[PDB]
Amino acid sequence: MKDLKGTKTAENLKQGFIGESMANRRYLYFAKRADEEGYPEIAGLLRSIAEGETAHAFGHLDFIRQGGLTDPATDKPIGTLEQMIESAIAGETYEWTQMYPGFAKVAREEGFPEVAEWFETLARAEKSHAEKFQNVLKQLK
């Protein structure tokens, strides 16, 4: 499609993607509370609305990719499958090398060791994810 680089629309697609991604997660989490409390029609509606937000997020990504823009999460191209895997590696690498260890250090300093332990678990998990994606890329290449 038409080149979107440098436009306000490019930034709006990114912000739309972020919001739709959060909406799907939020509504599935809310649905679990409706499930527990015995509101199956509410829970089912939440889950169906969440599928709408999936469609919205994926459509934002379609326009991002067709317009020559980069991944909202990593600023890396996601045109081809190899590029997609390279974006996954980059994001996971940021999370285990910088983001979650830093979150863990701050949580410990602020006196929240249980939250710190969670952030440390997540740091190890993202390193595992990064390693698994690196193996995929080697195999594609």
Next chain:
Amino acid sequence: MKDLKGTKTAENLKQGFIGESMANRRYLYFAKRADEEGYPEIAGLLRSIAEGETAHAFGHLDFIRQGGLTDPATDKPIGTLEQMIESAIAGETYEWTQMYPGFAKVAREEGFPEVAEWFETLARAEKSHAEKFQNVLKQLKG
């Protein structure tokens, strides 16, 4: 740990939630490409890792709620089910009354009519979602 308000850890839980939410969406989108091209093991790995990112996002929300913090998307409390639905209503109302119409106008003015039409479709969709959540709240209240 039950009062995290005003701490850096509170902001980090919010940012972690945002990143994990995007990761799940991204990896499921990437899996469709692996599917089409005939890489079922890659697609399966993407889907399985995406379930990990769901667990991470939900765990961040657990700590947010237990610490008395608000919904990352709307800054509203999400302790009870009614509060959760009220947060959904507020977010959807922002999206249909302000966010997507504004995005659509910018897209039209910049010469991207297909993107504008998509944003207009989404504005109407979020208005419908808001009405459905309003119905849910009516049902919870009797």
